[PDB]
Amino acid sequence: HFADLVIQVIDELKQFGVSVKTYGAKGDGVTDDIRAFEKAIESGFPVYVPYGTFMVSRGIKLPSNTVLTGAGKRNAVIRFMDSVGRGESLMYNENVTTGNENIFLSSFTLDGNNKRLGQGISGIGGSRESNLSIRACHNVYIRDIEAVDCTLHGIDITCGGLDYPYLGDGTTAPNPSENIWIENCEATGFGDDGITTHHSQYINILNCYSHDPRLTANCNGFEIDDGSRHVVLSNNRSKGCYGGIEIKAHGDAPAAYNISINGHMSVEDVRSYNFRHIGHHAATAPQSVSAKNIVASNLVSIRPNNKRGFQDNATPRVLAVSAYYGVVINGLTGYTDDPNLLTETVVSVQFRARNCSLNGVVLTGFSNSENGIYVIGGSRGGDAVNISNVTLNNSGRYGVSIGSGIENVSITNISGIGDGINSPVALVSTINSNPEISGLSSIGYPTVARVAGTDYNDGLTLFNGAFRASTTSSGKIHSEGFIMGSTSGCEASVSKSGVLTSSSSKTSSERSLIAGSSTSEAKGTYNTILGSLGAVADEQFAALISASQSRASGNHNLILSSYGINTTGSYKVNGGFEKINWELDSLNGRIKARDTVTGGNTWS
Amino acid sequence: HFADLVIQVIDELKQFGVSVKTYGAKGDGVTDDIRAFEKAIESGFPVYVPYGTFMVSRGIKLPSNTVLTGAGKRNAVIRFMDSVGRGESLMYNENVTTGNENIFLSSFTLDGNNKRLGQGISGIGGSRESNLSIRACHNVYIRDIEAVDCTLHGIDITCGGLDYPYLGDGTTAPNPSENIWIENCEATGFGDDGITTHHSQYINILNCYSHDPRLTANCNGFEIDDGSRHVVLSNNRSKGCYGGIEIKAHGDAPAAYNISINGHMSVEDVRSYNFRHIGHHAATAPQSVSAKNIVASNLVSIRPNNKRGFQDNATPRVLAVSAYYGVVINGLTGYTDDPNLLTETVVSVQFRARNCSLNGVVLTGFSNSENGIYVIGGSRGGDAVNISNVTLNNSGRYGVSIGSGIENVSITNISGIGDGINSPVALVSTINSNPEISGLSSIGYPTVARVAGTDYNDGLTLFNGAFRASTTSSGKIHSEGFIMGSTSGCEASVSKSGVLTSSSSKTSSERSLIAGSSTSEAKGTYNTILGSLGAVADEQFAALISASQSRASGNHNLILSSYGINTTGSYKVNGGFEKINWELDSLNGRIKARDTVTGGNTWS
Amino acid sequence: HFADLVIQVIDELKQFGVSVKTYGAKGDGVTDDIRAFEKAIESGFPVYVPYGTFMVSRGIKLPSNTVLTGAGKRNAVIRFMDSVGRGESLMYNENVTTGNENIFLSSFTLDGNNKRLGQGISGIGGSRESNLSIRACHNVYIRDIEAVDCTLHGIDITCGGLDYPYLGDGTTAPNPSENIWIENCEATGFGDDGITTHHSQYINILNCYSHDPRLTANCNGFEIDDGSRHVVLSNNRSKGCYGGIEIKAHGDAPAAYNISINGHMSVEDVRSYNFRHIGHHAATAPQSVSAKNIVASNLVSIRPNNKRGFQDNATPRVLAVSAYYGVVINGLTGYTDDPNLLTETVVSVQFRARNCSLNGVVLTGFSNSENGIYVIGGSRGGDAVNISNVTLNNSGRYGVSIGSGIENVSITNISGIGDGINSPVALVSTINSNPEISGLSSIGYPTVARVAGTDYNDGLTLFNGAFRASTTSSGKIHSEGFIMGSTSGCEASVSKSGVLTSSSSKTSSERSLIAGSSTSEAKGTYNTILGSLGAVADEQFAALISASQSRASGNHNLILSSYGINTTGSYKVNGGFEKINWELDSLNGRIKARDTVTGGNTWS
Ligand SMILES: [Ca+2]
Ligand SMILES: [Ca+2]
Ligand SMILES: [Ca+2]
Ligand SMILES: [Mg+2]
Ligand SMILES: [Mg+2]
Ligand SMILES: [Mg+2]
Helix, strand or coil: CHHHHHHHHHHHHCCCCEEHHHHCCCCEEEEECHHHHHHHHHCCCCEEECCEEEEECCCEEECCCEEEEECCCCCEEEEECCCCCCCCCCEEECCCCCCCEEEEEEEEEEECCHHHHCCCCCCCCCCCCCCEEEECCEEEEEEEEEEECCCCCCEEEECCCCCCCCCCCCCCCCCCCEEEEEECCEEECCCCCCEEECCCEEEEEECCEEECCCCCCCCCCEEECCCCEEEEEEEEEEECCCEEEEEEECCCCCCCEEEEEEEEEEECCCEEEEEEECCCCCCCCCCCCCCEEEEEEEEEEECCCCCCCHHHHCCCEEEEEECCEEEEEEEEEEECCCCCCCCCEEEEEECCCEEEEEEEEEEECCCCCCEEEEECCCCCCCCCEEEEEEEEECCCCEEEEECCCCCCEEEEEEEEECCCCCCCCEEEEECCCCCEEEEEEEECCCEEEEECCEEECCCEEECCCEEEECCCCCCCECCCEEEECCCCCCEECCCCEEEECCECCEECCEEEEEECCECCEECCEEEEEECCEEEEECCCCCEEEEEEEEEECCCCCEEEEEECCEECCCCEEEEEECEEEEEEECCCCEEEECCCEECCCCCC | CHHHHHHHHHHHHCCCCEEHHHHCCCCEEEEECHHHHHHHHHCCCCEEECCEEEEECCCEEECCCEEEEECCCCCEEEEECCCCCCCCCCEEECCCCCCCEEEEEEEEEEECCHHHHCCCCCCCCCCCCCCEEEECCEEEEEEEEEEECCCCCCEEEECCCCCCCCCCCCCCCCCCCEEEEEECCEEECCCCCCEEECCCEEEEEECCEEECCCCCCCCCCEEECCCCEEEEEEEEEEECCCEEEEEEECCCCCCCEEEEEEEEEEECCCEEEEEEECCCCCCCCCCCCCCEEEEEEEEEEECCCCCCCHHHHCCCEEEEEECCEEEEEEEEEEECCCCCCCCCEEEEEECCCEEEEEEEEEEECCCCCCEEEEECCCCCCCCCEEEEEEEEECCCCEEEEECCCCCCEEEEEEEEECCCCCCCCEEEEECCCCCEEEEEEEECCCEEEEECCEEECCCEEECCCEEEECCCCCCCECCCEEEECCCCCCEECCCCEEEECCECCEECCEEEEEECCECCEECCEEEEEECCEEEEECCCCCEEEEEEEEEECCCCCEEEEEECCEECCCCEEEEEECEEEEEEECCCCEEEECCCEECCCCCC | CHHHHHHHHHHHHCCCCEEHHHHCCCCEEEEECHHHHHHHHHCCCCEEECCEEEEECCCEEECCCEEEEECCCCCEEEEECCCCCCCCCCEEECCCCCCCEEEEEEEEEEECCHHHHCCCCCCCCCCCCCCEEEECCEEEEEEEEEEECCCCCCEEEECCCCCCCCCCCCCCCCCCCEEEEEECCEEECCCCCCEEECCCEEEEEECCEEECCCCCCCCCCEEECCCCEEEEEEEEEEECCCEEEEEEECCCCCCCEEEEEEEEEEECCCEEEEEEECCCCCCCCCCCCCCEEEEEEEEEEECCCCCCCHHHHCCCEEEEEECCEEEEEEEEEEECCCCCCCCCEEEEEECCCEEEEEEEEEEECCCCCCEEEEECCCCCCCCCEEEEEEEEECCCCEEEEECCCCCCEEEEEEEEECCCCCCCCEEEEECCCCCEEEEEEEECCCEEEEECCEEECCCEEECCCEEEECCCCCCCECCCEEEECCCCCCEECCCCEEEECCECCEECCEEEEEECCECCEECCEEEEEECCEEEEECCCCCEEEEEEEEEECCCCCEEEEEECCEECCCCEEEEEECEEEEEEECCCCEEEECCCEECCCCCC
């Protein structure tokens, strides 16, 4: 009774808040301590969990304004008893349907004791049976928690209700969680996902470690799932999962949107980064109206593989994007030391993914994979894929491959070493005839660029649309036209028309060229105007060379070395000065001079 | 007296350092505990604050080499009493003017009890009345502090002195703070800013949350203000403020410089990212000499709006840059679900901002805004704006708009969906005639590119300056000139001069073209040389076609199908072989042959 | 004996785990507490270190499954006694050769008491004598540790064994450490490095501060050394070191590979970011087979200098890359306010570095440095250097300089202010004749671009390889060829061949041009075809203008204004319609008509 008096004095000091041991907890790894937790938690004081293994016969419910802190991971341990049945998460907020506010959890281990159920078992339904489930809550800070041997997830942030709602694409579920911080947490040995979000927003997941699920279904390190939005993940690590970071939805739910990945390291996952929207992948399916806005940077992928046979032996990826609009990837390094682990495609952008950008990519060691980067589109309006500053080190028989359905591709500054690849084919390959391409460099690929079946092995620069260079202003240029090295006032307004080295000169002539000229105009077809001033060619095949103030208006009518004449004859070459003065008549075989025609001349 | 004996033994154990309760603190929410804090703090031991609300009748002064740690946010709470007057911050370093060293603060709530003053009140002047003020200090670590109901700022890092110094642009204030770490802190209900820096350097602000100011002036989540430099912000969140992150100075102070934003999430702020230097915005004002170097990446902006009417109903922005030189933005996602919240410009670069770069941008939902990105310049030398890899999803009647004063613009890989926009106009619009542009893709915009009033709807590629392609080396090329498909030794050295498909061929001829030639030279004006070897055209309108070793030196003198002749006649077509052998004289209407002229011929 | 009874009750409560004071530790700064630490650590309980300076006469050995936590930095202090000899780290895992698992260290100061040895002393050999040495361990979390006055390193993660292994390039040492987290740690006053990794993998180093080594050799803030791989550093700061972050190996070891830097701030280091592989730098040395894959972003460098004379007065750098393949840098800001601190090169890519990319760079104040960015290559196959979106503010007499051995360079969107530079030369300078360049803007540089000795001051756009614009598909284009403004079916298959404004027209003619034509073909040399339909030029210097269904097969044979003729004469101009009808014979000086030749004509 002396020790009990001393303890009473210590308890009253409340150095940490109130200890659970003050309310009767033993933390001996045997005794049911649930009532002690419930009493401390309802007391209104911040609650402290000291050293021990605190056994619990039912889930710990958290009310609003809870502070629960432990002595640390693997120091304060909270654990389900062997006798606990099915249906409850180990720790969760009390108001399951409308939520709670202001919950601060730090520094302990949650052990779900999934072992007690035998092997091969996951959550019984919906969000039930995670180690930590946060439903419809606002202002939740989760820090330095280790979640171990979990039946469903390690840590799950979701909307109100025990079930996950499936309300269809383009919806938002009632009672989201909001303002959540998950930092320095670890999740392992889970049945589904390590750390996951559903139908919630304004979430930061920082410096966490999720690894080694028990099962081999859709078991992801970080799963930003159905209904999520406005989430930042940064400096996390995943290991040995299906997806490292998955961002998705099911077919009957809205995809996660506006998600930022500010650095991540994926170790030996199947698909390190896996962004998708089930049910919105097929050509005959609707486009997702929710799968939009992902910005990911400083992404690391190491030895992706499917040794464990996740998802019925799904093929490995460094990055897989499907369904999503507006994905921006900057700074990606994929590395492997075993060429047989991933043999299909290292990076894929397919299945209705659109308006995606990849910049600053290094892929090394994928020497038995068919494709480094493989993009397939749907001939959708306003689509684009931009791939720039990519370096491939023995990665991909096709380094960058662009398939069907892609009309707008920009591929710039790609370099590749192919010497160590098993049967390399081409650094860059394109199905469409009009990719935009520049800055290719390679060694050990038999072909550098293959564009719609034509090989380019000595450098390539391809640009699309109306073209203009070395010209500070101009009028209209047709998409099959150009103006170069010209001063103001020029136009090339029809298919196959162009102006070079001229001033104030215009062509509306299909199949035409004006060069070295001023104030000249071509307006027929098959027109040529060269080194001329105030020249007009206005009939089919009409042309002028070294002419001033002259108009060629005849069919196949050419004017040479002339000033101030207008000609109209068919198949005639003419010259003159204020009046026509000679003619070579190809039609009738006549030669005519205004003055004399003579032989026996000398030029001195 | 037994309990007091037990307590004495516990106190002597010093398990945390020394508790404030050992020095008399009650932490009961009523009793003035200031003397207990002062005694513990002056004792030389690390100081611990256990569970309680510790009331204080004056500010807590911190000397050098202080360790002050609490039981945690909302566990250890430190609070001004209702009776406290004006002028003091709740917690600050003792040496206000020359500073202190080595201060380590962790795990407690600071409650400024601004309520006690009535509503609508902010700091009485300068840096006075923040929850935490650090002045002229070196080596300060601030961790897991919650700052609540603050009169001025939540956390303020500043130079020595109670007042903020206003020494003019280009200055550095004496006694900066240096080496500061602010991590996992929260600031809310403040009068000015949540977390702010002044006249200080070498600062990391990490994983903090600043939200919901009391007032509606320049009330920012994170304000990197007057005199700041060498600051990193990473993985912070701001919500419901004027600026999410503001980087600035007032007119009579140096702007913050060399600031890095390594990821941020802004939720429902007015201007999520707002970089400016007051007094250095107008065309007739001086350029800031201090506003330089901002690198920002992985920036998230959500539902920017001005529902609260901050700053006299300032218009919302995802990003606003003014005054600053050298701003690099990479990976920006702006998202809204309410088109009426922001109706002017989503991203603006204006008011003397220069040498700015935006890459990897996704803007979605801004379907009633006039401009997606709007850039205005000042025709300043060495200026540039680079915009690349941008995707717009129903954001901006003008997607990317370039206004006046901009001579150097690069706009590449821009795509836009305009179908859901209220009256869309153009994906890209340019006032200047010479933007550099490529890779535009759109649906639902009536015009794709409008360049100085001319529409391009079928693809566009525009480049500036001297142009060269498919040519590995050359001599000089004029800015209104080009060389293409040529081997070494070519030049096109004057306005409107160009060489195609040639070797060792040079033109200094204004309005000229050399093609398909070798060792040829044009040096008059209006010169054409085609399919020739060793040809020279050296007079106005002189030309040669299919000629070898020949020189055309006459006015409008054309040589055809010839070898080894030099001609000088005006308005003459000539041919020959070592000597001139025929002539078509346009001037006088004469035709001359050296040998015979005959009719009645056949060609067999 | 009453106080001892109370203490016994407290000890039994185990509020933190077990305190070292329970096992006899005094923490008085004098008494040897090693046996108390050893007893607590072997007890199986988590171990707590309360307030005190705990002196230790030998290193603290950590077994597997250790939890050791203190009252905090500068609160719980662990220190070597003055009498301790040489050879031991202060704290290390017990199994030096095969390693330990599951070690969790938090919240204390390690004071190595290097002072006790006199000044100028470092580790006696290999990994011996760091404050904290982790050898061959799995699952180690190191948090909130301050490492002070260290003999060797502050914190060292290494493989098994006391010595560092030197097994040669391309090897992997046995018994790596794996899964290591180092967060919020500080290292200072060390003999070698602050925080370093060797022969280990899956490591995150976050929010740490390494500064001010005692010595002036290879003394780095963060050194990712020999054998390291799969490491993320983020939001760390280094100050006053040789390298801020060094990534390297020695000559007889494999370089660190697949390293991510997700933001860093370097303050007054010599080489802020220094990536190298000793022994693999010289032209006559082997290429490193291990130095691959570095992705670094949001890098800050401030006032780099060598005031302390590190490494025999090595010259300062913002960034130095050598030996490494596949380095991607995005978002770099270098800033200085003292132009005399760094006078050679701000950023260097040299000494066998290859396939490197720099994007989004701002360098300001380096106004007495010779080079802003200086790249040297080795004429290696598949090499590339990409430099884009760079802004220089009075930094570098040569802003961007490309030296010898570089065949593939892309330099885009570079702008520079040179007005405040001491004798500026050129914004961009290139030794090679064929750099790819666009988007240059400058003020205050006397030359904008100098390309192999030729100056371009008015804008430049240079592209390499086969060129095509405003043409949606084509057949083959030679690398010294082009097709522009054309529709399908065109080819330009040989050197110096090109097609403009045409349809289904092909040239295999060296030095040729087809323009404004359809179904035409050039297959000789020196061929010109203009404004023609179904025209063939198949002999040297043959040409056709305004011709339909005609073939020019003569030497220097030109056809004009014709239909349906085939000509074969040498030095002849011909025209006709189904048959040849006139000829101008340059060879013999004859003029021939099929019908009449007449003078005295008029054209009305
Ligand atoms: Ca899952
Ligand atoms: Ca403010
Ligand atoms: Ca070293
Ligand atoms: Mg899920
Ligand atoms: Mg301010
Ligand atoms: Mg080393």
